[PDB]
Amino acid sequence: VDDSMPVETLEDGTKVFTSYLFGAGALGYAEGQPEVPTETARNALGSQDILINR
């Protein structure tokens, strides 16, 4: 059960629901890597600090 799925609308306020039926278990994905996966910088004449992810 999830609240976020594609839902469309036609005129006269009628709705259409999608509801994928997968039951697969599964497809696949992998994480991989960049370089510099995380970093921090700052602005000295001001006062700030940052984060990055990428």
Added chain:
Amino acid sequence: MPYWNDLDGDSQVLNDTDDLVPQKINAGQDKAVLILRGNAWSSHDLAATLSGSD
């Protein structure tokens, strides 16, 4: 930087009824220049990780 140029001139007719005259020396100048240079270069990152070497 300075320098002293060397003396030159006639001897004279060593003679009576007259006297001699002494003589003089000069000086001179020299210069130089200071110069300075430099440059830079760079790269992207994404390209580095995607290309297989650095």
